[PDB]
Paper text:
In addition, the DMT lumen is extensively decorated with microtubule inner proteins (MIPs) that bind in varying multiples of the 8-nm tubulin repeat, but with an overall periodicity of 48 nm that is in coherent register with the external 96-nm repeat. Here we use cryoelectron microscopy, cryoelectron tomography and proteomics to resolve the 96-nm modular repeat of axonemal doublet microtubules (DMTs) from both sperm flagella and epithelial cilia of the oviduct, brain ventricles and respiratory tract.
To shed light on the structural diversity of axonemes across different mammalian motile-ciliated cell types, we used single-particle analysis (SPA) cryo-EM to reconstruct the native 96-nm repeat of DMTs from disintegrated axonemes of sperm flagella (Bos taurus) and epithelial cilia isolated from either the oviduct (B. taurus and Homo sapiens) or brain ventricles (Sus scrofa). We find that sperm DMTs are the most specialized, with epithelial cilia having only minor differences across tissues. Our work demonstrates that the DMTs of multiciliated epithelial cells are almost structurally indistinguishable, with differences restricted to the intraluminal tektin bundle and associated proteins RIBC1/2. The overall similarity of epithelial DMTs reflects the similarity of epithelial cilia in general—they are all approximately 5–10 µm long, consist of an axoneme sheathed by a ciliary membrane and have similar waveform dynamics. Nevertheless, the absence of obvious structural specializations in DMTs from epithelial cilia is somewhat unexpected considering their roles in propelling liquids of very different viscosity, and the different sensitivities of tissues to ciliopathic mutations. For example, genetic ablation of the β-tubulin isotype TUBB4B causes severe loss of tracheal and oviductal cilia in mice, but has no apparent effect on the number, length or beat frequency of brain ependymal cilia.
Residue numbers in the entry:
A (entry chain JO), B (entry chain IP): 1 to 428
C (entry chain 5L): 52 to 101
D (entry chain 5B): 116 to 169, 172 to 173
E (entry chain 4Z): 2 to 53
F (entry chain II): 1 to 39, 46 to 440
G (entry chain JG): 1 to 440
The structure:
Amino acid sequence: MREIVHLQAGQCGNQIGAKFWEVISDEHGIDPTGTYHGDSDLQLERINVYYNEATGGKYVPRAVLVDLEPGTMDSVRSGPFGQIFRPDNFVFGQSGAGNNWAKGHYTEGAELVDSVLDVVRKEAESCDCLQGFQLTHSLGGGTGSGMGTLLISKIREEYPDRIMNTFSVVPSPKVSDTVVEPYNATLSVHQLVENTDETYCIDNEALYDICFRTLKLTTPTYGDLNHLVSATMSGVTTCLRFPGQLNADLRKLAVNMVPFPRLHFFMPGFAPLTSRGSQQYRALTVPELTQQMFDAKNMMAACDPRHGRYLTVAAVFRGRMSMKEVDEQMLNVQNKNSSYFVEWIPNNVKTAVCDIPPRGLKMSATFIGNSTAIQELFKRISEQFTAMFRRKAFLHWYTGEGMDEMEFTEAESNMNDLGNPVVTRGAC
Amino acid sequence: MREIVHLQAGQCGNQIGAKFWEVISDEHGIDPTGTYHGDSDLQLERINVYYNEATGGKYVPRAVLVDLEPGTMDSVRSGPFGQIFRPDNFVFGQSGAGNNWAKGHYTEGAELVDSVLDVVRKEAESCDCLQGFQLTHSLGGGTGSGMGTLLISKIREEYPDRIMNTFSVVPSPKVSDTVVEPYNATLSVHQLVENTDETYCIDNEALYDICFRTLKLTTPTYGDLNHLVSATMSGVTTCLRFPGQLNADLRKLAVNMVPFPRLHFFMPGFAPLTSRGSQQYRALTVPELTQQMFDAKNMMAACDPRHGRYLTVAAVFRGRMSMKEVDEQMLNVQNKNSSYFVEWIPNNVKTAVCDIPPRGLKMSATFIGNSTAIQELFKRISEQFTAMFRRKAFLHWYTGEGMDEMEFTEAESNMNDLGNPVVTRGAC
Amino acid sequence: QNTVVQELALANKQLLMVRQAALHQLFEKEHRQYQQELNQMGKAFYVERL
Amino acid sequence: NEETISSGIIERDTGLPATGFGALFTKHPPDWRKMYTLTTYAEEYAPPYQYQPFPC
Amino acid sequence: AKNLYGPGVRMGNWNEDVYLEEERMRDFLAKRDEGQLLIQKNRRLKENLLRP
Amino acid sequence: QRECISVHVGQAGVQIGNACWELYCLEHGIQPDGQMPSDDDSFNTFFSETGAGKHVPRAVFVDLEPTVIDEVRTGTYRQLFHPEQLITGKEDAANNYARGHYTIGKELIDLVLDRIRKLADQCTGLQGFLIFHSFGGGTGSGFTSLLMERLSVDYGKKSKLEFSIYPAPQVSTAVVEPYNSILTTHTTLEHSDCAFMVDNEAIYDICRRNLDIERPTYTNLNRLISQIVSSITASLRFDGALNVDLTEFQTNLVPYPRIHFPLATYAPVISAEKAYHEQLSVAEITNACFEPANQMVKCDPRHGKYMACCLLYRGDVVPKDVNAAIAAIKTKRSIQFVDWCPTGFKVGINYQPPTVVPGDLAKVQRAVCMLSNTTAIAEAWARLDHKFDLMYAKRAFVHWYVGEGMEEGEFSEAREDMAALEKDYEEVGMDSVE
Amino acid sequence: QRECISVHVGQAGVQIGNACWELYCLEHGIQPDGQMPSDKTIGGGDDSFNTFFSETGAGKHVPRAVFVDLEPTVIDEVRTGTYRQLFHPEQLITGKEDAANNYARGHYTIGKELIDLVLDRIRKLADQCTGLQGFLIFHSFGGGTGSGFTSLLMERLSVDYGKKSKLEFSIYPAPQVSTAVVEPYNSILTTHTTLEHSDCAFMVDNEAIYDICRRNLDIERPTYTNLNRLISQIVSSITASLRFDGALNVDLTEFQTNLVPYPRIHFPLATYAPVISAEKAYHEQLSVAEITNACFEPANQMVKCDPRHGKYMACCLLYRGDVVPKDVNAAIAAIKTKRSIQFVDWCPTGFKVGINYQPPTVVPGDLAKVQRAVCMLSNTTAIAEAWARLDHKFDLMYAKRAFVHWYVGEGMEEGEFSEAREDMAALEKDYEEVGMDSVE
Ligand SMILES: Nc1nc2c(ncn2[C@@H]2O[C@H](COP(=O)(O)OP(=O)(O)OP(=O)(O)O)[C@@H](O)[C@H]2O)c(=O)[nH]1
Ligand SMILES: Nc1nc2c(ncn2[C@@H]2O[C@H](COP(=O)(O)OP(=O)(O)OP(=O)(O)O)[C@@H](O)[C@H]2O)c(=O)[nH]1
Ligand SMILES: Nc1nc2c(ncn2[C@@H]2O[C@H](COP(=O)(O)OP(=O)(O)O)[C@@H](O)[C@H]2O)c(=O)[nH]1
Ligand SMILES: Nc1nc2c(ncn2[C@@H]2O[C@H](COP(=O)(O)OP(=O)(O)O)[C@@H](O)[C@H]2O)c(=O)[nH]1
């Protein structure tokens, strides 16, 4: 019996977590009052992966809602699946991050991380074999950028043998939602690289591409945009909660998904995605699932994988099916696109079959890919960082909180030492 | 999708287009206040052709209004369908018109064309696939001629891939409302030959001989006379606004209707027409519709078809009807009037039909005619121009306003060099 | 209350469609029996090119 | 309004069929939230020959 | 830019808009059938405690 | 297995295909929703199947302008058709080969080719393309010519049949229609495997005389064309005695490789309360196709030689009766063959009666589709040749074509190809003397 | 919970605040007497009104501002008008001697009789203030009160509240039009001492709003009420994301981090969209792209400075209403694509987005009822032209000792005049230093 604590900070993290708990409460059969109303015992069999049991049949999430500014976490409580969370894991403070990594990592964020650790540690012995932790946050911005990585670091040194998955909203090419995103996300990545085991870069413009020319929506809201993130983060952790053939866990995924300890930056994809007008006409089968999955069109990161070679690939399929279709489709796509796959790593796709589809769909698949194309993200953020660091701008706010120039220098050096190895594996 | 921008210049153009917007609002279902109140869902099928929207389903017409006298602007605003237009499109100017082509072209008329082109530019950039521009104006007089042809020139320079419809009222043989009508008509048609893609010459005397010989009214005013103009402007642009078998838009009409690029002056027509006493004794059917097109007492340009061979004849029907009827009827028209139809264009008739007829009518049809009969109108204007020009009369207020001697002869030479082809192709 | 108002809008539209279908059926049946009794009386409706 | 929803009768004779081609709407494709909750083991490791269920 | 067209207007992404409206009505009628929709949901207490 | 993909280009093709799928849904037993009412393999040939039981069509409704696709996707068949192949442009092609082939051809040729590929993915045997267009409007000429270039490049080993509207020799509904017809026929001569010409004059005369409809409209015209379609591609729909796929048409109809223009006619086109008064025998259905009044283009068959003709019998027809009818026909001295084709008939038998749509035609136990590649089609080509000669003698309507992407020499190339085709027709029609 | 204290200084500041709190009251549903008719509304639940209006056992929603003025009759207008019962009697601080449009009288001599009482009031409002987000300073660079009492106030608030946020909404001296002769003295000697003590200072002008009301609001004969009611719209777009909920929750501390790249350069330029006049707004689209382009059109800026004569260094957009982020993305991408918005080469990420789900509420007045709005604040180099021209005014006026005696005989030494001048020289030196592109 294996367990994941879902701890999340920031506005993006709290809203993505709210949509995730809505999605997993849907899939497991819990109505917003906290009671179990299901139809099959398969839902309740592994309910102790995300939902702690209380008296009266009340299932409370293993969530740690964290924020410095209690404006949007309070809206998470006011949300649809709001009266399900513990009041005691609503840790907060009376301040503002001000989208500052310095004022998330070296100030009142460090005053609040002790209470967050008390909550997370108190939850940690309500366990038998905890598998690990999930942090969903925004690298570009505050709160989850600095204090999220502070949580990552201190949790990593307090529990070192538990798998950490961070779903991180990276900055974006066309529009930036904060002008200090190049500072914030680079200083967050510098702490990410010697810490986290499975990162998943999620880009809002990649979400725009998926929601505009696959889903075909006119008014794509953040509800649906974080609902895709909820779908892929429910799809990665599926066999931990439902039976099947060739079950896969998160450490199972990591050892089959990372070549080297630093090269753990992925790019995900959830892809039985079909427009509402073409849903009745869709012909859901394994070959078209694999086509929609390996198309460079449905990716949640804003990097085209046709410019770089995949190192490793995982496909977590869900549904009652013959799985040689999955096997032959992996081999067929490997043979058809050989220039986009490395040759020093053979047979570099993991198949992970589960027996239960998502509630509403019929047969699904979640993609994980350690692509060389993630180098475009880091090169773009390197140009963004060095352009506004060469002139030493937007930086007195950083230095006044207790940090200096050398930490920017070390973060830049470590993030170019991210640039070197993925390039040399893309060029052998 | 496709759009048309409605420009109206001069007092005549303003009144004609205001009555046009009344007719189009009645046809589509927009009330005087602007809120859509129709009976069928298919009236809102193609509402973008003439109307842009606003907040709350309020449809504002895509019309640009200009004149030199800020009193016709107040007349249009205080009209019944007046508070529907955009108030920023009411591009007036505290100056004089003085029915002078020089004063509307080289001077204070051209001192407002920058703001007019700014409004037209924003209305054209707020589109996706613009089909073109229709301008309503008076050929004789100022403003509609003076600023009108300049507006045609600048719009043609900015957008060289759109159809220019120009609904212009030509000066009449029997009566004149301005003693410099030949001057303005020649200096306006000189620009209209090499600029606009299709004109619509609507003479007042032929417009009103309808009101005798078919309508049998006693005292019709201009509010009655511009309604036939509005009926034809509605009937031309009807297959791109309402569905029907064998559709036909403005540019398909232009390619089927303009053989040589200079020869694009048409005579209009609308022929489900009969008097109030003769309505109940009539046998409304496609053959009698075709005959009422081809009789020389219904058309709105004082040009006899028996004075010249027809080059092309377009007929855009509206109403539920059979196709063999209309095909055999226009073939029978071609065969019966064989000598008055050209031989070098076999099947010189373009046919089109549309489903819904105008309200209060069961079948209607608009008539477009390009013959050699326009040589009478152009030659009469040329004779009257050479009558007023050989004694240099009414010309010092062109020269003092800033116009020189030599391009008067250029305009007259272009008039005669447009009279030359429309008599050579009469005798092949 | 917001989703309740949305729900009243949807219920309005549903009863609109079912009422329109019933009214169309009733008007067609009324027209048929009016034509039948007029044919019994000796007259008939005028349809364009009937 | 809120007080008239029970008053508004919905089960009248439309003439259009209940479900099928014309209708006014469909009823099963709307929300088939219920999954295929039926594993491989349960599907094809079923009791092969039917047996009486059963100690002291 | 564009002209930002509304419902019923057939200019733009109207086919997916009308399929989405059909889906919304369709889910509302599913809620009608299984009787959990919000138009009653008190309406066994709302008037059964308000009976004179 | 034995499937075919239909591409419908232009408004003529779109509403002809509307009548076609109206016929097909009730022929194969599918409600216009797309769900079979249930209580076999036939459903495969034009309808793919998706999941729950719904039978989507193997068509691509492509039109450079809206409102014609919009009538379909807001009409009574809005749920049968998948919205992705209902491919619309934003600008009418406006009766121009240049505007249908060069300027707005590249904004939609990628989309239409991608959807042809997507429809051809879920198919085992590509028996052919059935392509519905006209020789009139700019879309129906230019875009189908571009589609011929691209589909000859991408699917060169497969059959492609065009079911084209020929311009009416008497009325017609355009002035540049001879331009567009001759240009698209020039550019699609080398790529069309077989072209079937149907004409509005002839369908008008058939509706007036045999269907006694004095005021027919285009839904009746496209319905009568749809009967030809469903009669010709029926032997790979149902089972019978002598089933013919499109490969027998692409083996038997064409003696000489550039002569691939047969004319196809129907029988029982009788008018619902009219044929209680004769037998509708096999002699009737064989003789009426060879009568010079049900010919679906305005060419006189006595002014020509029949080179090959395929009869496709449909319904309760015993093959003895067709053999007797062929023996009766081959003693006629007015139905004259060529001397190099002693056996000139290709018979096919299908065991199912034609299904009736609520409308004009009546359901009968016997029907045929007759495909004759007569040499009389040269007169039809020569009429439009004469029209183009008079229109081109003084450069009429040439600037709309040239200023949008034509070069001037394509008119001369089309004239040279048509003169060569006329020479080929008279050379294949001349009798052997050596 | 998340509440900020407004401070208003001078005639200009006090009737900034009168219209500002009219709009605040009709945004949160609060009656002019001090109560609310009924709760259960999005504006007045708890978390939106707690930002400005406090509570009281007898339903009284007491303000969180200070209305300080060195002279009476404006404070007396406030406590005589319709908002007499709302504002607390000590909440409106009045002096007994006008500042006489002298920075020396605003700062040095008559400031000491009132600064202790003002700090006592601000200490009280901060005592009943759980999470203090900052102080919103409303004043002018013109007359003596807003020139000098603010100059003392930023110093005292930096002494006692050093880590706190300070957002000035300053009436800058207009390029041409003016209301005084000693505005070149007062603006320079106020900015010199509040440059090191003000965290961020959005400067809104008067002639620019004059042109805005003349051109868009279609009113040829308007007053100060129509002038700064639009500034009340500005502040109601700035400090609203912490009041309501939305897609992006932008904080008061985020504005200073995203608009102030350097310690001394903290001078953004404000503008607003929908400014249309309610018989013209319903014949236009008013889409997200159009209201985004309206802010960046070089006529809708609320300070008369041309962005073409300079380069942007930061921009924040506060979208408000039924605005969608995926039209926000398209509009910002479109405004980044074209050339005349020329950003500097040391911030390709130069945009902040803050989205609120509350549509703007119309006051009974001249602005239209709209469901979309955006307030755009741009820190740009184009303000250096106005600063250099103000320095030209100061040098022409100081070269022969005009009005020096009033300042020096009041308590101020002469050397402060030379010290502020070289402070402005250093300010324009920093402005021209941050201008050119990087070449190293
Ligand atoms: N059966 C049938 N034939 C049609 C229909 N519409 C047009 N035709 C024939 O097609 C010819 C001209 O129409 P099209 O060639 O289809 O025009 P198009 O393909 O839409 O191209 P554009 O005119 O540019 O839009 C006419 O001469 C008709 O004979 C139709 O709706 N049904
Ligand atoms: N909306 C609005 N703006 C104002 C108003 N009064 C002044 N302003 C602006 O404020 C500037 C001067 O006001 P103040 O600085 O407050 O005048 P003061 O501080 O009271 O100075 P003195 O009374 O002369 O000692 C003018 O230049 C105006 O631009 C007002 O009443 N309403
Ligand atoms: N997918 C998704 N992303 C979001 C959502 N809300 C915010 N974001 C992203 O979060 C970033 C800013 O968040 P931030 O200001 O750091 O919130 P904070 O961590 O509380 O300070 C933006 O770039 C958004 O793209 C959401 O609901 N869904
Ligand atoms: N059909 C129609 N013609 C009009 C109307 N008003 C004026 N005209 C014609 O317009 C001509 C003169 O217009 P003009 O003087 O050029 O107007 P201006 O451009 O404002 O100076 C006259 O000969 C009239 O016949 C109208 O309401 N309807």
